[PDB]
Amino acid sequence: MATGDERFYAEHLMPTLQGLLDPESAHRLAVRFTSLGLLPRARFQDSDMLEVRVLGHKFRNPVGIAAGFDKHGEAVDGLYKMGFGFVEIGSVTPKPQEGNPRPRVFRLPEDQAVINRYGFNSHGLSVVEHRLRARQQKQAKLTEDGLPLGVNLGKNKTSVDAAEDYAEGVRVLGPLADYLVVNVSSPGKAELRRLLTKVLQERDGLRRVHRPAVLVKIAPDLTSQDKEDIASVVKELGIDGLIVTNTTVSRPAGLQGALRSETGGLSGKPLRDLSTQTIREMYALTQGRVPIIGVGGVSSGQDALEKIRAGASLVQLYTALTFWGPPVVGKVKRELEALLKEQGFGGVTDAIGADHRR
Ligand SMILES: Cc1cc2nc3c(=O)[nH]c(=O)nc-3n(C[C@H](O)[C@H](O)[C@H](O)COP(=O)(O)O)c2cc1C
Ligand SMILES: Cc1c(-c2ccc(-c3ccccc3F)cc2)nc2ccc(Cl)cc2c1C(=O)O
Ligand SMILES: CCCCCCCCCC[N+](C)(C)[O-]
Ligand SMILES: O=C(O)c1cc(=O)[nH]c(=O)[nH]1
């Protein structure tokens, strides 16, 4: 057990844990350990180079934990201790729901990938609300210290009115979040405008200290038309940002994992460049004026900086954590800082969208 060390986790601890446990058991255990603060390190001290000011907030470093690891808001503080510059919880649905039957997550070790069809298993808004209320002032200090909190909002499976599910989440969790996320993406145009109009009106109805940024999270499987439409609505309505991307329902040629034909969203290395390209396109479509959080197959500084250069102001990872473990956070940050220096950027901020100016 005990402490590391990137090599010890990646070469020994994590693979052993994967050989003993199915992915959902290891996920639950990870959330357990993290929430108790049973973490190695973190020996990495964030430099001013890594600091980003975006979405009305200061981010100590641009490396966050993506939605889906901490679905129910149970490990937020342990995730900050892990070295993440921001935490996104969820997706959270209005009512509790169990999600899909098990097994519903599948490891593709040869591809450094996962396929998941959790189906939005959620403790629901009420349980999450109280859990965030119990630490609300602690979070206010973390946020002020440059460690913001995002809440990803979902909808119930049997929901009659999608927009109202999101509106409810906005009202309930919005006062507790630095930013909110609406998935247009889990595996309109006038309909999308309709939904996002409602979400933004609900957000604007909150008291001034309790007003989060609103971001839209997209899949990497959208047509060119979908992406044009989204960009257009985002700019018309003044959506605060985009998260790019969710998992893919595509199966790129070359996947080796025996489980590659499982239904669900694919994450990790095979998603990486598909996601970066979507960032590139969404940045150009929004004239570099809409903050993007880049997510999809990030496990190194190069991965992170490619997304930043492509137009991301911030990045997230998830699947890398499942293979490398907690030390992956400091690894990405250390490598990113070294790459920024090597490439003559003063900091992360100078690198945002740098490819578009070549
Ligand atoms: C186990 C699993 C569950 C996920 N659950 C959610 C979810 O609840 N809501 C969401 O927006 N994204 C969810 N995601 C997608 C991730 O947030 C992220 O967009 C995607 O995995 C790409 O990042 P990655 O390659 O670093 O994993 C999930 C991903 C995985 C691996
Ligand atoms: C190992 C692991 C892990 C995982 C991640 C982090 C840790 C960990 C956390 C706190 C301290 C020490 C640790 F090793 C343990 C285990 N998480 C997952 C999350 C979601 C899914 Cl689908 C799979 C996993 C897996 C896995 O591949 O089994
Ligand atoms: C989920 C398996 C986690 C096993 C790793 C245990 C973390 C080491 C704890 C380090 N420390 C002594 C500081 O608590
Ligand atoms: O809960 C899930 O099944 C899920 C949600 C989501 O937004 N993305 C994903 O890959 N899985």
From Swiss-Prot:
Its main location: mitochondrion. It is a single-pass membrane protein. The active site is at 186 (nucleophile). One of its GO terms (biological process) is pyrimidine ribonucleotide biosynthetic process. Keywords: Disease variant, Flavoprotein, FMN, Membrane, Mitochondrion, Mitochondrion inner membrane, Oxidoreductase, Pyrimidine biosynthesis, Transit peptide, Transmembrane, Transmembrane helix. InterPro entries: Aldolase_TIM (IPR013785), DHO_dehydrogenase (IPR050074), Dihydroorotate_DH_2 (IPR005719), Dihydroorotate_DH_cat (IPR005720), Dihydroorotate_DH_CS (IPR001295). It catalyses: (S)-dihydroorotate + a quinone = orotate + a quinol. The identification of DHODH defects as the cause of postaxial acrofacial dysostosis (POADS) was obtained via exome sequencing, demonstrating that this method is a powerful tool for identifying genes underlying rare Mendelian disorders. Exome sequencing consists of targeted resequencing of all protein-coding subsequences, which requires around 5% as much sequencing as a whole human genome. This is Dihydroorotate dehydrogenase (quinone), mitochondrial. It comes from Homo sapiens. The lineage of its organism: Eukaryota, Metazoa, Chordata, Craniata, Vertebrata.
